[PDB]
């Protein structure tokens, strides 16, 4: 679990969105596993606007932050699950690192701010859904 709070928005993994998230929906994309809902209170997370490939992510299954090198956002195959059929998830970035299904939502940050959230994993790898291109989260 985990969310990004920026302005009047809440950013979560689409496969983990609540009833409240869907009743206050702003935008959603199954192909990115992202969902954005509106909030009453203000959010103080800063989104990075950069092409950084290094950063730190929170891993809840270890209660630890890990530094990582990560790939550029791209279309990557993701095996079927209870939430989606087997497909290409777009805007996905991979790193060598530990993750388990309950790790989705952990924030990945660089020196510029929030880069994205844990969305995939398996075989000593961790996948992050990028949010750096969502320029509207600030305006
Ligand atoms: C950090 S998630 C994870 C980590 C290790 C292992 Br084994 C398995 C997982 C689970 C996982 O990758 N998915 C299930 C939830 C939907 C995800 C998606 N974005 O399509 C795919
Ligand atoms: Zn950066």
From Swiss-Prot:
Zn(2+) 1 binds at residues 50, 52, 110, 112. It comes from the Viruses. It catalyses: Selective cleavage of Tyr-|-Gly bond in the picornavirus polyprotein. The active site is at 15 (for protease 2a activity), 33 (for protease 2a activity), 104 (for protease 2a activity). Cysteine protease that cleaves viral polyprotein and specific host proteins. It is responsible for the autocatalytic cleavage between the P1 and P2 regions, which is the first cleavage occurring in the polyprotein. Also cleaves the host translation initiation factor EIF4G1, in order to shut down the capped cellular mRNA translation. Inhibits the host nucleus-cytoplasm protein and RNA trafficking by cleaving host members of the nuclear pores. Counteracts stress granule formation probably by antagonizing its assembly or promoting its dissassembly. Homodimer. This is Protease 2A. It comes from Coxsackievirus A16 (strain G-10). The chain holds residues 869 to 1007 of 2193 of the full protein.
